[model samples]
Target: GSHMGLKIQYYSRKPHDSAGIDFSFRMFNTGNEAIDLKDVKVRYYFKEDVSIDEMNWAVYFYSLGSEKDVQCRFYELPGKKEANKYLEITFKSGTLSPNDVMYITGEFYKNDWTKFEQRDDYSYNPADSYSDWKRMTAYISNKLVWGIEP
Candidate 1:
């Protein structure tokens, strides 16, 4: 969450990250300025734990916005502690006005459906419903504006 300014209502929708990674979030623009939605990036960080070192991840997500498509990019962080990978999330296009909220849902897995020990992830949460969660981080135009990141 972005302090008292912008708030993100979020939860881990998956029972566990054993088969896949799933989550949903609602971002409310509480700041004074209008947000260029395309410039906003929300990140979920985790480690890839499987037998194989090389992983071909199948990532997917969507946002119920003026445009429904959500773009996802998978990054591999080789030596970082806690998280060895992260998913950068962005919407197709839109403008977020002050006090406006947008909904986002995402899921990702190995094309082979391997298990992920996401509980060890820096951003992992056990919550099943929405709230102000800080484990995940948010940014606008590359400047961080919300939550904590490892």
Candidate 2:
């Protein structure tokens, strides 16, 4: 199925001036067939004050009704002028049938707990909840399907 959708709503606890970055999302399948989660990926483009190893994804919370195992990886995009790195989140296993929805909440921070100057980050939006966001993007089988990326 190709009709996958993503809605990213930022968590307010850790705003741009805070030490941590937080957010949650709603992923739903609008396609006719089931979509395998393994081929899916979510990316958040950001500016990094520290090296890639200094930061880590702090959450992988999944919907209670849609359990899944996922992994997080960081990539350095030295070639980019705006966002120098991107956090790639991938699902280890799961599936979404037509109209099925999956939800998740997460936070990201430096390993040493240093404060992040996130206001300049490309995808750093101050939001509490509700609807789709364009700064963050999602992909299925490496093809973008939801939102826009840097």
Candidate 3:
């Protein structure tokens, strides 16, 4: 059986800078068998006031052949529904193999939380948005890649 592993590395020194932040991550298969990855989804937290420009985001993978950017979907936690924002990127099918790596980077824009607080959606803000390290969750899909189950 093959197991998937993930590692995050920051490309920007000022992760907490009020202006914005940048970073990259590595997703690899640690098990002996090859792992198929259909797509990778990430949910990253940020100030509700912050609006992410999808144009500033990017992803890289050797298996993508000549494609520079994968299919992407961007949106925020809806008003009065959730506590954080997120960006989701879907890699082409068979884009990941055992030991293969995917790299991603983004140059985000941040606004004053104070100004954002004046808005109605401010109530949905996550208490930890002001923390030094924002929360980011990621998942690699095996079901989408291959419907095989052990």
lDDT of 1 at 81: 83
Q: TM per model? A: 0.81, 0.84, 0.51
Q: After superposition, how far is residue 103 of candidate 2 from its true place, in Å?
A: 1.2
Per-model CA lDDT versus the true structure: 0.71, 0.74, 0.42
Candidate 1 regions with alpha-carbon error over 4 angstroms: 1-5, 49-68
Q: What is the overall TM-score of model 3 with all chains considered together? A: 0.51
Clashing residue pairs, candidate 3? none
**Backbone clash count for every predicted candidate, in the order shown:** 0, 0, 0
User: What's the distance in Å from true for residue 29, model 1?
Assistant: 0.6
Please report how far candidate 2 places residue 80 from its true position, in Å: 2.2
Ranking by lDDT: 2, 1, 3
Collision count of model 3: 0
Cα lDDT tens digits, model 1, 1-150, are 333245667777566546777756778888888787778888888877543334443334444454345777777767778687887877668777788887765666776766777778777777766778787888887888888777
Q: Which stretches of candidate 2 lie over 4 Å from their true place?
A: 1-13, 64-68
lDDT by residue for model 3 (51-89), tens:
555324444343444335555555666553444455555
Q: Which stretches of candidate 3 lie over 4 Å from their true place?
A: 2-11, 18-20, 50-67, 78-83, 110-135, 142-150
